[PDB]
Amino acid sequence: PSLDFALSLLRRNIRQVQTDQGHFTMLGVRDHLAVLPRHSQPGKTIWVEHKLVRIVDAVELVDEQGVNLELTLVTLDTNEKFRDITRFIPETISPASDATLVINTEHMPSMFVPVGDVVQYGFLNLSGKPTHRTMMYNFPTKAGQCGGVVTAVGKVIGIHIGGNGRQGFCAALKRGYFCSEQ
Ligand SMILES: *[C@](O)(C(N)=O)[C@H](C[C@@H]1CCNC1=O)NC(=O)[C@@H]1[C@@H]2[C@H](CN1C(=O)[C@@H](NC(=O)NC(C)(C)C)C(C)(C)C)C2(C)C
Ligand code: NA
């Protein structure tokens, strides 16, 4: 049952964080590497579970032509490594059924939100930035769900970034994002 996978991910890979931009869900992917929504704009340090943590390095991810993907990769000065979940990230972006959004912020503590089908949306204007590889679910997402992890059928497929009051939008994850070979 999928709540099993979602729980595992919540406890081993998902952290509450705070930046100067607000409260977000962060996904640790492997080693000291984590992913956030670009608009969290992490600086030199970040609150992770109410402890101050140094960011060694941060990169705003782009597609081949330099278009925004609305994701930032951070290298954290943490003591222990995240369980490697890269094998749960698909190589290519595909639609999925029966997805759950796994969220954990001060505004939205540990919650599992069934969002249904997640499908490729593509081009989005995000606060005036052209953005590629977005996906959509027919769920009215709200304040404090950003960084929320989209999971379906043992797969980690997106990071929640926005909503229009009716639908919710995530930045797709691909395995190649955590790997220099792809
Ligand atoms: C997120 O930052 C958070 N902290 O929860 C938030 C999630 C939104 C808020 C209400 N419902 C949600 O799912 N994301 C944002 O506020 C993003 C952020 C800025 C605008 N934005 C939006 O979601 C806006 N709508 C929007 O961009 N709609 C699309 C184009 C995605 C259909 C808005 C009007 C503030 C809710 C940026 C950088 C995209
Ligand atoms: Na969140």
Numbering used by the authors: 2 to 183
The authors write:
The main protease (Mpro) of the betacoronavirus SARS-CoV-2 is an attractive target for the development of treatments for COVID-19. Starting from crystal structures of the Mpro in complexes with the Hepatitis C virus NS3/4A protease inhibitors boceprevir and telaprevir, we optimized the potency of the alpha-ketoamide boceprevir against the Mpro by replacing its P1 cyclobutyl moiety by a γ-lactam as a glutamine surrogate. In line with our original goal of identifying broad-spectrum inhibitors that target the main protease of coronaviruses and the 3C protease of enteroviruses, we also assessed the inhibitory potency of MG-78 against the Mpro of the alphacoronavirus HCoV NL63 and the 3Cpros of enterovirus A71 (EV-A71) and Coxsackievirus B3 (CVB3). Finally, coronavirus Mpros feature a catalytic dyad comprising a Cys…His pair, whereas enterovirus 3Cpros have a catalytic triad consisting of Cys…His…Glu(Asp).
Using 10 µM Dabcyl-KEALFQ↓GPPQFE(-Edans)-NH2 (↓ indicates the cleavage site) as a FRET substrate, we found IC50 values for MG-78 of 6.7 ± 2.2 μM against the EV-A71 3Cpro and 1.45 ± 0.40 μM against CVB3 3Cpro. Crystals of the EV-A71 3Cpro complex with MG-78 were grown in cubic space group P432 and yielded useful diffraction data extending to a Bragg spacing of 2.07 Å, whereas the CVB3 3Cpro complex gave crystals in space group C2 that diffracted to 1.65 Å. Compound MG-78 binds along the substrate-binding cleft in both proteases. Similar to the situation in the coronavirus Mpro, the nucleophilic attack of the catalytic residue (here Cys147) onto the α-keto group of the α-ketoamide warhead leads to the formation of a thiohemiketal, with a covalent bond between the sulfur of the catalytic Cys and the α-carbon. The carbonyl of the γ-lactam accepts hydrogen bonds from His161 Nε2 and the side-chain hydroxyl of Thr142. In the EV-A71 3Cpro structure, the gem-dimethyl groups of the cyclopropyl proline make contacts with the side-chains of Leu127 and Ser128 of the “beta-ribbon” of the protease. In particular the latter interaction, with a distance of 3.3 Å between one of the methyl groups and the Oγ of Ser128, has to be considered energetically unfavorable and may well constitute one of the reasons for the limited inhibitory potency of compound MG-78. The same could be true for the short distance (3.3 Å) between the Cγ atom of the proline and the same Ser128 side-chain. In the EV-A71 3Cpro structure, but not in the CVB3 structure, the P3 tert-butyl side-chain makes contacts to the ligand in a neighboring protease molecule in the crystal lattice. Whereas the crystal structure of MG-78 in complex with the SARS-CoV-2 Mpro revealed an ideal fit, those of the complexes with CVB3 3Cpro and EV-A71 3Cpro demonstrated some steric incompatibilities that likely reduce the inhibitory potency.
